[PDB]
Design a protein around this ligand. Sequence first.
Ligand SMILES: CC(C)CCC[C@@H](C)[C@H]1CC[C@H]2[C@@H]3CC=C4C[C@@H](OC(=O)CCC(=O)O)CC[C@]4(C)[C@H]3CC[C@]12C
Ligand SMILES: CC(C)CCC[C@@H](C)[C@H]1CC[C@H]2[C@@H]3CC=C4C[C@@H](OC(=O)CCC(=O)O)CC[C@]4(C)[C@H]3CC[C@]12C
Ligand SMILES: CC(C)CCC[C@@H](C)[C@H]1CC[C@H]2[C@@H]3CC=C4C[C@@H](OC(=O)CCC(=O)O)CC[C@]4(C)[C@H]3CC[C@]12C
Ligand SMILES: CC(C)CCC[C@@H](C)[C@H]1CC[C@H]2[C@@H]3CC=C4C[C@@H](OC(=O)CCC(=O)O)CC[C@]4(C)[C@H]3CC[C@]12C
Ligand SMILES: [K+]
Ligand SMILES: [K+]
Ligand SMILES: [K+]
Ligand SMILES: [K+]
Lengths: 254, 258
Amino acid sequence: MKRQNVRTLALIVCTFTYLLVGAAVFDALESEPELIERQRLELRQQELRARYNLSQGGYEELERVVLRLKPHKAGVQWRFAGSFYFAITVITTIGYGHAAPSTDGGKVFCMFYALLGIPLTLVMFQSLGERINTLVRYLLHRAKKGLGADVSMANMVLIGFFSCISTLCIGAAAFSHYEHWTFFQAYYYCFITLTTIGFGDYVALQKDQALQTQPQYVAFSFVYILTGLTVIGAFLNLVVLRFMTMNAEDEKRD
Amino acid sequence: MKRQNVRTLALIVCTFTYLLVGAAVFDALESEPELIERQRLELRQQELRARYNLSQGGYEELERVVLRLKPHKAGVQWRFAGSFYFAITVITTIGYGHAAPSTDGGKVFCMFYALLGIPLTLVMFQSLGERINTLVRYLLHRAKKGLGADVSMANMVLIGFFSCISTLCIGAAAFSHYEHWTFFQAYYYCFITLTTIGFGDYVALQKDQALQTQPQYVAFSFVYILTGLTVIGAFLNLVVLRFMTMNAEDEKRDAENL
Ligand SMILES: CC(C)CCC[C@@H](C)[C@H]1CC[C@H]2[C@@H]3CC=C4C[C@@H](OC(=O)CCC(=O)O)CC[C@]4(C)[C@H]3CC[C@]12C
Ligand SMILES: CC(C)CCC[C@@H](C)[C@H]1CC[C@H]2[C@@H]3CC=C4C[C@@H](OC(=O)CCC(=O)O)CC[C@]4(C)[C@H]3CC[C@]12C
Ligand SMILES: CC(C)CCC[C@@H](C)[C@H]1CC[C@H]2[C@@H]3CC=C4C[C@@H](OC(=O)CCC(=O)O)CC[C@]4(C)[C@H]3CC[C@]12C
Ligand SMILES: CC(C)CCC[C@@H](C)[C@H]1CC[C@H]2[C@@H]3CC=C4C[C@@H](OC(=O)CCC(=O)O)CC[C@]4(C)[C@H]3CC[C@]12C
Ligand SMILES: [K+]
Ligand SMILES: [K+]
Ligand SMILES: [K+]
Ligand SMILES: [K+]
């Protein structure tokens, strides 16, 4: 078998085993708490339905309204600040889903916007990420020469990994302050955001109508998401991007 | 200014103007409908509170229960199938958020799982994506030679773009059938899924306890998500990936020439 064919199959076997292992661990950690919570909420639902004289249909009618009012609870999510925050979540592929296009026209424009947007954003983050690495490589060379000079890959991975921890922790500190979350919750939010996972379980600019009433904080969250993604982008550019071109290099060598 | 510095600044200016333009269009398309819906829902809330003799506190107590029961409504989301589906959404960066770790330990393991997972998944999709492109390049060369032979970039972009359309169309055909959505809704779901955006407004395997009762459909969904991402991955590898290494090539050209 060819080196590319061995590498590709190894990666497929790795990913599928990583999924089985993950599924096994996530089962062990979340199965029983979910079954416990489901039973606890069902009892809490039966108590409230009895307390306010509510039937099966009566509860269901109130259920639809509460669920439909959830995206409105955070406030106006579609003015300039709301649409700019949403535009970020699309092109950066975070996509929290806190605000999603409710109209057919909005859904169409969103698809075309992403089609051209995501490549533009990826290229931009890899270009800016490279310039940051080139600056760090120069600064470290000047530091080595200054103190009393060659910058290695290992030195770059070290600065890179610490740069990532620094941005998650700086973010965590500020989001635990403004969103009134624990440092762990704000750290988990920052991790899920900057890895473009964006579950939407934690979303910034949702409390106390921040998108409309807090301009300073909306400006910070926009700056952090974009700068933070460049730090993660620069780390992938250094560690991960080299292995992607490797498959084409071996075919070029053939 | 250096070519790299001009290119990087141009891209920053491009992205920020693309954001302003996007924000302007999304405002024009969604602002008024949202106000109309908020008003309509604000009236309904008041109507039902009056019908069933509910106070401000009484509604708020029922509000917490309805919101907390939302992830449970779909059924069991954390057994083997549900955890495997969740594991996909993490490492592929789709992250619908239909199911999210409710425990502190689950949140910790998820972070470590993503840290090593996302690079492994990205590398895997670019490696498998390249093999698909190499196979297409060989098949098209054999077809040109067979019918009556060089495979150009333009020929590859054409096959690539059509490979994206057909995958979304095959998907929309299936998800509109099983998840009882319109072709447009299922197509929009497939687009948002395969671009790793994953808003979570549309999530497959939630209706009629599909994760537990429908193993045949679950098997298809996992295979479609994974194969579909390889098709999108192969297209990015062909068109977009050639521009990312460009910034390093110009810096390599600076040191070599001087
Ligand atoms: C903290 C984050 C950003 C770092 C995560 C580590 C990655 C750099 C690792 C995780 C999985 C690794 C891959 C797992 C499996 C393989 C197959 C392996 O293939 C072989 O050994 C057979 C072919 C050959 O010998 O070339 C080559 C390395 C590679 C791509 C690995 C390259 C490095 C990867 C992407
Ligand atoms: C490379 C970096 C360091 C600089 C990038 C430029 C920033 C200074 C810009 C880019 C996006 C801008 C934001 C885009 C949108 C808004 C919303 C805007 O709020 C409203 O319009 C409120 C009313 C509404 O919702 O319509 C206030 C300014 C702000 C935060 C902007 C502040 C300035 C920002 C952060
Ligand atoms: C359907 C999808 C897969 C295709 C999306 C199109 C992309 C291939 C486009 C979208 C934005 C484009 C970028 C927009 C701006 C620039 C800056 C531009 O810089 C200059 O012209 C100045 C420097 C120089 O002359 O080298 C170089 C091309 C580049 C990176 C473009 C490369 C091609 C991109 C990524
Ligand atoms: C190269 C590609 C086309 C092949 C990849 C291998 C597939 C055949 C595997 C990979 C993941 C597998 C799935 C992983 C998880 C499940 C859930 C499992 O369902 C349960 O365990 C139900 C009860 C529970 O929820 O725990 C049934 C098999 C199925 C669909 C598996 C069927 C076979 C799949 C699609
Ligand atoms: K989401
Ligand atoms: K993503
Ligand atoms: K998401
Ligand atoms: K995402």
